[PDB]
Design a protein around this ligand. Structure first.
Ligand SMILES: O=C(CCCc1ccccc1)Nc1cnccc1C(=O)O
Ligand SMILES: [Fe+2]
Ligand SMILES: [Zn+2]
Length: 330
């Protein structure tokens, strides 16, 4: 068994190795990368996502989300309050303002301490889930807008043609903007490229221990748990590394910097925060190894969790028994 401690692995593909996405994901897994639930990939020195980021101020964030916290410092829920549209130029200026800017800090460790101590007392604004891409059309390797689709993977493995098209999303962040504990829709993989700006810190639980996190979550958020058997799908629940330690939940942490890829693996619970103004791009993907996770994925049928048009087909084909109840749920 490779990577039995489930450590987060960091990869440095050569230009040649960076030419076949599926092959390299399979290679990473042959080294046990998936057992951590998250891997970092540093692209070849000669590679670039696009020429410059000089002309991105005019992107619209149609619905910025103010992330409002309830609970205690290390155990809280966050709800998203919709705000008026703003351009990325306006957003960046807001992120850099005295009210929202990254505070003085010694290092990543000091900033993490400040995040968990102080996060709940501020309400940062997140420009999340914006359909689009910042990869140059001519970028041929690891272009998140040119990956093979989940629908084609499911067709290749199961011999069934289905509707749907999955495309990338942009995320414009500032200090304290947060992603709550979750696995991907249908326990898919995700790939995240940090285009520019300040770092993003990640926490992850190994897939083999995901049910331990779920059990702790039910204990820590009893109301939410009664409401929905898969409430973590709502992406509202935060639990600090201190609280995870106290409860013996195995986990790992790593900081992603601009120019680096992170891949999350099937059923790898993850959460994190942004250090300051930044922009990331992400998309879900699948491999043959995902199919069995897709079949076993928990579903929110309470109506809260956002269902994409594409997920109908995944549930319909992989989870026919669950399909009706899930459908009437939302
Ligand atoms: O889920 C999110 C953003 C929150 C989406 C959301 C949740 C609830 C309500 C509105 C939007 N973001 C990520 C997820 N998984 C890995 C990384 C991120 C990220 O923010 O870079
Ligand atoms: Fe995610
Ligand atoms: Zn639910």
């Amino acid at each position: 068994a490779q990577n039995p401690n489930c450590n987060i692995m960091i990869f440095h593909p050569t230009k040649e190795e960076f030419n076949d996405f599926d092959k390299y994901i399979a290679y990473m897994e042959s080294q046990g990368a998936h057992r951590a639930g998250l891997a970092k990939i540093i692209p070849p020195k000669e590679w670039k996502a696009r020429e410059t980021y000089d002309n991105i101020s005019e992107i619209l964030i149609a619905t910025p989300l103010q992330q409002v916290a309830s609970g205690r410092a290390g155990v809280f829920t966050q709800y998203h309050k919709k705000k008026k549209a703003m351009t990325v130029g306006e957003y960046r200026h807001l992120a850099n303002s005295k009210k929202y800017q990254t505070p003085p800090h010694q290092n990543f460790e000091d900033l993490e301490r400040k995040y968990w101590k102080n996060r709940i007392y501020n309400s940062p604004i997140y420009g999340a889930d914006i359909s689009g891409s910042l990869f140059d059309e001519n970028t041929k390797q690891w272009n998140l807008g040119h990956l093979g689709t989940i629908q084609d993977l499911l067709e290749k493995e199961c011999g069934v043609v289905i509707e749907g098209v999955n495309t990338p999303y942009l995320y414009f962040g500032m200090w304290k903007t947060t992603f709550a504990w979750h696995t991907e829709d249908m326990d898919l993989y995700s790939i995240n490229y940090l285009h520019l700006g300040e770092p993003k810190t990640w926490y992850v639980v190994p897939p083999e221990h995901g049910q331990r996190l779920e059990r702790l979550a039910r204990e820590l958020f009893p109301g939410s748990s009664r409401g929905c058997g898969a409430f973590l799908r709502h992406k509202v629940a935060l639990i600090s590394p201190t609280v995870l330690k106290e409860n013996g939940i195995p986990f790992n942490r790593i900081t992603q910097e601009a120019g680096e890829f992170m891949v999350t693996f099937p059923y790898g619970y993850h959460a994190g925060f942004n250090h300051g103004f930044n922009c990331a791009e992400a998309i879900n993907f699948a491999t043959p190894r995902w199919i069995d996770y897709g079949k076993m994925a928990s579903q929110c049928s309470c109506g809260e969790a956002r269902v994409t048009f594409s997920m109908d087909a995944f549930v319909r084909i992989l989870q026919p028994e669950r399909y009706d109840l899930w459908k009437r749920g939302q």
